[PDB]
Design a protein around this ligand. Structure first.
Ligand SMILES: [Zn+2]
Length: 194
């Protein structure tokens, strides 16, 4: 039925993000960031895309919602080092959480939701919004699990026409993502499969 192009997308998309908060920055280099989460552990986050370079300085308070590109490390010195790609953002939260309008469609007929989260942030990195949608896709809506369901797209459409998108059939092009958006200004999000 399928091939590595799917087995591997099935892996990365079904698993799960990390979600840290009020972490500090231990250094900011070109497309590279070394943070320290509240729990003593430090993270080596990278930033492919030139459009998306975060300029948070040593001392600031950041939030992660990144994903690990490889299993973690334990130095025989007592410090847990993560290896995660993108996600860093600011600690602005909204007074009372909202749930982003998403609507998965499977070849025509409306597909209802099963356990789609309640968001409390203002600025969510597009890496995050991708992982969410596709995560909720590979799980409840069963994507990358059957030959019948190997492709499609999703579409965020803002409260001022701007649009963003991605094609389920390839991993999010991390090397070209634009900065984190205020999720309260999303008119709608969509997803359609096959
Ligand atoms: Zn330890």
């Amino acid at each position: 039925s399928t091939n590595d192009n799917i087995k591997d997308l099935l892996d990365w998309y079904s698993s799960g993000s990390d979600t840290f908060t009020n972490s500090e920055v231990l250094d900011n280099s070109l497309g590279s960031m070394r943070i320290k989460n509240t729990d003593g552990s430090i993270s080596l986050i990278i930033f492919p895309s030139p459009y998306y370079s975060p300029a948070f300085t040593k001392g600031e308070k950041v939030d992660l919602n990144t994903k690990r590109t490889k299993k973690s490390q334990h130095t025989s010195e007592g410090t847990y080092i993560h290896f995660q790609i993108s996600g860093v953002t600011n600690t602005e939260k909204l007074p009372t959480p909202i749930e982003l309008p998403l609507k998965v469609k499977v070849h025509g007929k409306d597909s209802p939701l099963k356990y789609w989260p309640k968001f409390d942030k203002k600025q969510l990195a597009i890496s995050t919004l991708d992982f969410e949608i596709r995560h909720q896709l590979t799980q409840i809506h069963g994507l990358y699990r059957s030959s019948d369901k190997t492709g499609g797209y999703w579409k965020i459409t803002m409260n001022d026409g701007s649009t963003y998108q991605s094609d389920l059939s390839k991993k999010f092009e991390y090397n070209t993502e634009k900065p984190p958006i205020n999720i309260d200004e999303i008119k709608t999000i969509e997803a359609e499969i096959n």
